[PDB]
Amino acid sequence: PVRQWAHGADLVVSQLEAQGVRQVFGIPGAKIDKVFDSLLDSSIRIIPVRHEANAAFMAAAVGRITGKAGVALVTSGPGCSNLITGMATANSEGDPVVALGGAVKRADKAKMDTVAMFSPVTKYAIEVTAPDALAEVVSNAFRAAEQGRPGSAFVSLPQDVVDGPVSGKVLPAPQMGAAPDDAIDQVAKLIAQAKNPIFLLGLMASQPENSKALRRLLETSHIPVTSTYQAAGAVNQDNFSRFAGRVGLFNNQAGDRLLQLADLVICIGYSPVEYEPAMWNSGNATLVHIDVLPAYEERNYTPDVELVGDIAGTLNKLAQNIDHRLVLSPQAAEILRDRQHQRELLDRRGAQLNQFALHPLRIVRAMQDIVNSDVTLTVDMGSFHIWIARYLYSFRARQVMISNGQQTMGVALPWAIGAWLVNPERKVVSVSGDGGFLQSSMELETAVRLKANVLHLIWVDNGYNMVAIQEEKKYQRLSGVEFGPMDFKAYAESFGAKGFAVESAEALEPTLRAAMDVDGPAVVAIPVDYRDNPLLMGQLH
Amino acid sequence: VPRGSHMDKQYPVRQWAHGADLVVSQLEAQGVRQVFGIPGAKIDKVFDSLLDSSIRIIPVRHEANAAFMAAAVGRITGKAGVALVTSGPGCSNLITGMATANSEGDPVVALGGAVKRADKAKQVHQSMDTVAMFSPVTKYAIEVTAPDALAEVVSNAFRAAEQGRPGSAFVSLPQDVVDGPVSGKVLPASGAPQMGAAPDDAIDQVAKLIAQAKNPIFLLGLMASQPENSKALRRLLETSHIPVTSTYQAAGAVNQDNFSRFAGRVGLFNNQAGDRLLQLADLVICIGYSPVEYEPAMWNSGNATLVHIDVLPAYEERNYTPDVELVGDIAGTLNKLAQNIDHRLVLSPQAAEILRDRQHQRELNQFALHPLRIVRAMQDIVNSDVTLTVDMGSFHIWIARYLYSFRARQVMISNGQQTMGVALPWAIGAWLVNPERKVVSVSGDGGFLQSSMELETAVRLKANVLHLIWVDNGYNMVAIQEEKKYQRLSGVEFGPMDFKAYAESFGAKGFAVESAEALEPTLRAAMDVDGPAVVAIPVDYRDNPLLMGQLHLSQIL
Amino acid sequence: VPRGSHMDKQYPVRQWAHGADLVVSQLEAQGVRQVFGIPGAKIDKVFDSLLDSSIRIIPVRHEANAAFMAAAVGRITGKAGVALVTSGPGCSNLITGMATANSEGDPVVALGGAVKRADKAKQVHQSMDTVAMFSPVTKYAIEVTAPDALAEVVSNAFRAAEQGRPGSAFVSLPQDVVDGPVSGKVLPASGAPQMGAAPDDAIDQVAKLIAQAKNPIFLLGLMASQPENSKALRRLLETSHIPVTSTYQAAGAVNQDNFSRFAGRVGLFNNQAGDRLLQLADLVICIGYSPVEYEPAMWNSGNATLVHIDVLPAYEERNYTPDVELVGDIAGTLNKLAQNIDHRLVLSPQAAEILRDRQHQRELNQFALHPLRIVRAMQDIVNSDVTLTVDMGSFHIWIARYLYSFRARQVMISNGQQTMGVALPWAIGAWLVNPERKVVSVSGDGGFLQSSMELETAVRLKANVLHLIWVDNGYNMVAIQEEKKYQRLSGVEFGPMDFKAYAESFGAKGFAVESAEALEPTLRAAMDVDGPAVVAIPVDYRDNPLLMGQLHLSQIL
Numbered sequence A: 001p002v003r004q005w006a007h008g009a010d011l012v013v014s015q016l017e018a019q020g021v022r023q024v025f026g027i028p029g030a031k032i033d034k035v036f037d038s039l040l041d042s043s044i045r046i047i048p049v050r051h052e053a054n055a056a057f058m059a060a061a062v063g064r065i066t067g068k069a070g071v072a073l074v075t076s077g078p079g080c081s082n083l084i085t086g087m088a089t090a091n092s093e094g095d096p097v098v099a100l101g102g103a104v105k106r107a108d109k110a111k112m113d114t115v116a117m118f119s120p121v122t123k124y125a126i127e128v129t130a131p132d133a134l135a136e137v138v139s140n141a142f143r144a145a146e147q148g149r150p151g152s153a154f155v156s157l158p159q160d161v162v163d164g165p166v167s168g169k170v171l172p173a174p175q176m177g178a179a180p181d182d183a184i185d186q187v188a189k190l191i192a193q194a195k196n197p198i199f200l201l202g203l204m205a206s207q208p209e210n211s212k213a214l215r216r217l218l219e220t221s222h223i224p225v226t227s228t229y230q231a232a233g234a235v236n237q238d239n240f241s242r243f244a245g246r247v248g249l250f251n252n253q254a255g256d257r258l259l260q261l262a263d264l265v266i267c268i269g270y271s272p273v274e275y276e277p278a279m280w281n282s283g284n285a286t287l288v289h290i291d292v293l294p295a296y297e298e299r300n301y302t303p304d305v306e307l308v309g310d311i312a313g314t315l316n317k318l319a320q321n322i323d324h325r326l327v328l329s330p331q332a333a334e335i336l337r338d339r340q341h342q343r344e345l346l347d348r349r350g351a352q353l354n355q356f357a358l359h360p361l362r363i364v365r366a367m368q369d370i371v372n373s374d375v376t377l378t379v380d381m382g383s384f385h386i387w388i389a390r391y392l393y394s395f396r397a398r399q400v401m402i403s404n405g406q407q408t409m410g411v412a413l414p415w416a417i418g419a420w421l422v423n424p425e426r427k428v429v430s431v432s433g434d435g436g437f438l439q440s441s442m443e444l445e446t447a448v449r450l451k452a453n454v455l456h457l458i459w460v461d462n463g464y465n466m467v468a469i470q471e472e473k474k475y476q477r478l479s480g481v482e483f484g485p486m487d488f489k490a491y492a493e494s495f496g497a498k499g500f501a502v503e504s505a506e507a508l509e510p511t512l513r514a515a516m517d518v519d520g521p522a523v524v525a526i527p528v529d530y531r532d533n534p535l536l537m538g539q540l541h
Numbered sequence B, C: 001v002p003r004g005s006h007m008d009k010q011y012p013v014r015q016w017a018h019g020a021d022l023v024v025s026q027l028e029a030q031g032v033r034q035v036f037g038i039p040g041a042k043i044d045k046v047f048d049s050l051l052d053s054s055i056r057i058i059p060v061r062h063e064a065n066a067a068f069m070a071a072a073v074g075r076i077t078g079k080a081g082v083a084l085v086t087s088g089p090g091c092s093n094l095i096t097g098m099a100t101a102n103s104e105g106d107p108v109v110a111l112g113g114a115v116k117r118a119d120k121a122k123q124v125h126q127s128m129d130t131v132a133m134f135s136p137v138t139k140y141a142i143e144v145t146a147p148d149a150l151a152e153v154v155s156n157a158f159r160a161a162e163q164g165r166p167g168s169a170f171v172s173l174p175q176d177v178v179d180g181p182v183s184g185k186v187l188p189a190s191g192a193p194q195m196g197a198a199p200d201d202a203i204d205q206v207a208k209l210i211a212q213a214k215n216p217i218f219l220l221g222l223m224a225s226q227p228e229n230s231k232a233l234r235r236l237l238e239t240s241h242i243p244v245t246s247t248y249q250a251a252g253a254v255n256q257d258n259f260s261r262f263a264g265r266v267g268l269f270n271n272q273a274g275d276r277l278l279q280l281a282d283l284v285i286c287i288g289y290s291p292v293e294y295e296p297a298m299w300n301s302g303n304a305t306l307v308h309i310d311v312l313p314a315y316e317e318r319n320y321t322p323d324v325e326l327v328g329d330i331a332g333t334l335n336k337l338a339q340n341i342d343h344r345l346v347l348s349p350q351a352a353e354i355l356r357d358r359q360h361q362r363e364l365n366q367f368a369l370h371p372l373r374i375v376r377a378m379q380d381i382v383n384s385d386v387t388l389t390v391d392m393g394s395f396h397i398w399i400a401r402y403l404y405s406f407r408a409r410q411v412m413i414s415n416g417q418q419t420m421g422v423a424l425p426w427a428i429g430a431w432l433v434n435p436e437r438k439v440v441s442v443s444g445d446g447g448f449l450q451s452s453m454e455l456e457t458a459v460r461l462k463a464n465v466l467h468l469i470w471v472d473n474g475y476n477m478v479a480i481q482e483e484k485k486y487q488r489l490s491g492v493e494f495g496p497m498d499f500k501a502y503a504e505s506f507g508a509k510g511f512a513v514e515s516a517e518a519l520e521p522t523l524r525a526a527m528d529v530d531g532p533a534v535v536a537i538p539v540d541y542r543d544n545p546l547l548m549g550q551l552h553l554s555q556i557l
């Protein structure tokens, strides 16, 4: 219904409601405060954060889970530029985010060029200069964020546009069918002829709408699977016997050996940016691309067969047309048997008593004890990230947020807060180093204020270890990587959250269990002995 | 055997002596048959490497026209036409042509020379960031900074130009990259994706809307004209019997000879059959259409249900917010829709009356010639075997107004950016694709002189092109609007020329119509010339104000 | 009485009916005497408002040449030439011309139409973000989005074009802004700033360097040619007696007639007097020079102390990192330096020998004509009362090589971007500034046909321009380098034309040289024509490889 609106902000809020938005994250200011004011009259919850960067991280968590964009709302100038890192992180990981940023009155733009600053790190960036287009622009931002391979979108809203009246109407919010039957038959024939097929899963294969169809295709075909880190949660060792690990980080993965051995590779939901094809595509295998978009071709990614459409309907049709389960070639069996032994060796069953400060593998064990299938895990960036990534095969979480191609620090706690708001009846564990922690730890006030049931673990080394380990390897000396200690227990408690500090190994497991039982935000500082990190870092590409 | 194989004898991995050789080998894999351009030092190794190829070098006389010629090739073949130019002004002379191709959806790849990578940042070259200059007028614009990426970038440029909604693509080639060695292979070209149709539930939703509509109409856009959609479109029209109108970009997607309920074109006039059926419609089904082709505020009354069928979701703007989107392979969607239509449309009395009115067309000795006399004489020489290309100016409006009585099956007229000078270069490009057929190009005297340097190219090629000039000694399309708004003229009058002698100085055949009676015999004589000819036709534009009141005037730039 | 007064009867605050009227009033305040361009609907109110002004409307036949003509006006008058075009292709047709003006430092303001503000974002217009397209090739590019800013933006565009190091500036004018009402006043134009000279301690530092140098030389750039610096430059040269060489952008900053130690120009050759003195120098003092004019890697051996004198600090690049910078008003700095020079330079034997060698110049009946024969005949008709303009191609190198024996005081040849087509439009612009003087323009057949449409403009204006074509039926400058590198040619040959008849079809006088003996009498006859004339001169380019070995070959685009 074309309505007359007293304020553009009111039409904005009504469009947000049509988009299923449940919360907005951000920080108000004069240029944008009419949108904040209009939200008082809506069902949408206003969540003030303490740094705009984290509004973008929280929004990304909401977008990743729900498939509908999370929303950040900030004022002009620094409110917008404080989003840029967060928006680039969302765009890189495929998380649907819409950021609405205030701007000066249109008449004053003559006397920050936010659109130019956001264009390199968004799918869509635009400023509303014609009030008659307000709802169209917002709708287009959600469509850009949510459709295809999702990503981030930025809309600049001049103060006079959202304050003044407008004429317009709200616009209501699967958009593709399955790949054609002839293409399904073509792929099914290739599968029937292949001796060493393998599935390479990318981002879109991990979307919730695809989980049942993916499982049916794997159950029917029993074809080995390897996954990019964007798709780290699509399949795991505990739910598929022919899982070959995540590829992209470690130089000794079954998935890579199977990709090298393959005579047929079927990439599902995958874009080359997720794992450089020069690393895995020999060119000797027939290459099938299945995604919501055409292939992003490059010299090491020129598919022989290209299917575009609804992934679930496509995989369901494909499963319906596979004649027999794969019988592994002897080479493929050995690769997977090799990986079983690799996993046993990584478990370190017999070298199981430890020393202090805590050995990383001891911390991983204690984390895997408290993270079960009802718990979400978020992972920051740092040396601990490599440890957790190495042991993803033995984590059994509801969901793991870990993929981080920009390698942005500070993501874990805001990701966890956003994920908790989606399913607040559940617990979230976030883990970071001490460097990443302090880049977003201001949101502990937000977490206390929300009573968010988040447990944050800090691997404490008083430095930037992941950088130090590389400096030591290249130069045998450290520079800019050491800093001072903090009383993290007292730090957490000054916010009104529960604090814990692990003063002994034996206290590790009971402390984490005690922290998990807190109904609300808790922080646990865990001193770590990274001496053995060179051992793990040598397992990297 | 796989496309990416490093042991394919048809696409071997080689240590190429010059990156230019790999570029040329890649062009061959893209099906390129000729390149249009002007050489210079930075790009001359690509010109040289083309000597060892089956690809023909066609030197033009101004780079803008290389882009125009390439667009004609792209539109007709569906594979990108290619322009090749040197650094600096060789590149910047392409920008209007690349914008025109991108706006019309014509696949064009421009390869432009650049200074050596080490010299890029020197102040001498600060006013020629060509990627920044081409980004606003292309789908794809990139510079090759790594020799290993040479084939990938050229391949990706063709893929951007040709796939999705086609458009123009620019590649900057630094001199040291094309002159120096490279290791790599050609990337074999891929076809269109095997794309799902729209979802079945959405298609049923639209079938039900069709069953309930009293005045449905199909609005065809650019992608409806692609050959992969031809059979499916024909079958849907035969099964549904729903009327159809086409934007100018939809080209010959449908013709009156095959479908009795074709209402003609939309995009310029406000009062023709297609416009009246769109105004009457309770359901508009757009196929392969984007608002770039025809501003929706001009045709969408907001009273009809709106369906969007295309390979891409809609970009919602004012007056184009579809109620249902059918996203996917157009042919697959149309085939599924045709299966779910239970009966042929019984036209409303008003709709039947609109189409009957279009069927009626009753088919002037003043000198200078009346526009209608010129149109009628052109319709005599332009038969189904002849391609027609049309420039921009008042004559374009006359020709568009009576396009229904031209029987050329190949017409290049669509020109949303309203670029002058396009007609002769479009005609040369079209002739090169089908040299066994005559092309007739038509312009005003303003547009003629913006690209007439290519008459030398036409003579050198022996192109069978007849160019007609409507001569008024001014920029009439601008004058009409100035007279209407201000009742006085500014900047629209210039002096006369002897266009017969002008054409002959190129070695083309020249003609000038000096009386009304001489029009038709002169056109026949110029048509019988086997090679380039130019005919000047003095025109009396007195009646033009009456035609422009039938136009969407706000669209004129 | 103050410049910003709201009660100035000479610049009243008004409720203007149309923003276009305020634009035109602002142009009058900037001293604009004519505008070059092509109208269209979006911009036609500015054309209309010019009817009520003393400013002359000059319609051109291709927008590129409006930019070229404007550059000639800017260079000669020091106040920006003005191009006026419509939206879309009217704007994008300017880009090469704006880049050429910016690179040469010619002040040019282009006013381009645009769609109404409300329509800017519609998809039809997505390929014409003109500010983004012009930003890489201008000093200043902006769109007026607030009517209250109309005069400010036009004023600021002239200030960007004219002040500092001059260049080109673009203003986008939305149709609704120029058609609708505005409240405001004209902004009176300001002069150059009253700028301090370089600091006294730095000037003494350079005076001491002069006192110690055995082979000092002045290298003059663009800003040395500005009239405000003329007396100061002359006085410094007379006091110091230091030799001087000029980039091509320095124009007529110094001539051999006034200063006996002028070594000629640098920028193309590697072996002329200026190049040898720069190679010999222990001290190089650059005045008004920027590396954009002449790549420092070509001339700076790194063995001399380097002084930078300009209104702006240096931008340090490879081979241009000055040891002392004298930043400030050039005239003020040169006047202070002259006061601190204690004696005239005694030239070194080598330096004196270099200059003696330049003084020697001993001042061929084959057909086609030898280039040297053509140069010598041109030197007969080009006297101090005649302006000479020169296009790009091999003939440019010949003319540059013997520029020392042309006695025209006004020569437009500098062309770092190497843009073809410049000469005829430059000549028309120059003639409009001083219509009492003859202009001779010279091009090849390639460059001729890129701008020859302006022969109609020349005939319509009755411009006293003689255009000479060196005719080889190819793109020779490219062919020479292809032959040298590859020993074969590609894309450089085209067909012949009857240029006499070509010119006559415009109503210009045409001539064709058919024998060596006929060259000089034909040139004299074409020179005696009072109005536009064209002379075709067949040229034998066999010897060109010998000339190009004297060039910095890497500079050719």
Ligand SMILES: Cc1ncc(C[n+]2c([C@H](O)CF)sc(CCOP(=O)(O)OP(=O)(O)O)c2C)c(N)n1
Binding pocket: A381, A382, A383, A384, A407, A408, A409, A432, A433, A434, A435, A436, A437, A459, A461, A463, A464, A465, A466, A467
């Ligand atoms: C925003 C940003 N800046 C720089 C960096 C650089 N950096 C990392 C990159 O991934 C590697 F270049 S990780 C990291 C943090 C290390 O500090 P902690 O969090 O304490 O973890 P620890 O390894 O000690 O366990 C850094 C600094 C960053 N990621 N992100």
Ligand SMILES: Cc1ncc(C[n+]2csc(CCOP(=O)(O)OP(=O)(O)O)c2C)c(N)n1
Binding pocket: B392, B393, B394, B395, B417, B418, B419, B420, B443, B444, B445, B446, B447, B448, B470, B472, B474, B475, B476, B477, B478, B557, C038, C039, C040, C041, C086, C089, C090, C093
């Ligand atoms: C490159 C360019 N500049 C300006 C315009 C604006 N314009 C549109 S039609 C036209 C007149 C064309 O004159 P002509 O070719 O002689 O056609 P006529 O209307 O006189 O028949 C102009 C100048 C344009 N469309 N393209």
Ligand SMILES: Cc1ncc(C[n+]2csc(CCOP(=O)(O)OP(=O)(O)O)c2C)c(N)n1
Binding pocket: B038, B039, B040, B041, B086, B089, B090, B093, C392, C393, C394, C395, C417, C418, C419, C420, C443, C444, C445, C446, C447, C448, C470, C472, C474, C475, C476, C477, C478, C557
């Ligand atoms: C717009 C443009 N395109 C290409 C070039 C490269 N180029 C430099 S000189 C030249 C040849 C010019 O031919 P012509 O005008 O006939 O002069 P000639 O050398 O034959 O005497 C070319 C194509 C250029 N400088 N400018």
Ligand SMILES: [Mg+2]
Binding pocket: A118, A119, A120, A121, A122, A123, A124, A125
């Ligand atoms: Mg972007």
Ligand SMILES: [Mg+2]
Binding pocket: A382, A433, A434, A435, A459, A460, A461, A462, A463, A464, A465
């Ligand atoms: Mg740390």
Ligand SMILES: [Mg+2]
Binding pocket: B134, B135, B136, B137, B138, B139, B140, B141
């Ligand atoms: Mg672009």
Ligand SMILES: [Mg+2]
Binding pocket: B393, B444, B445, B446, B470, B471, B472, B473, B474, B475, B476
């Ligand atoms: Mg005309």
Ligand SMILES: [Mg+2]
Binding pocket: C134, C135, C136, C137, C138, C139, C140, C141
């Ligand atoms: Mg700029």
Ligand SMILES: [Mg+2]
Binding pocket: C393, C444, C445, C446, C470, C471, C472, C473, C474, C475, C476
């Ligand atoms: Mg030539």
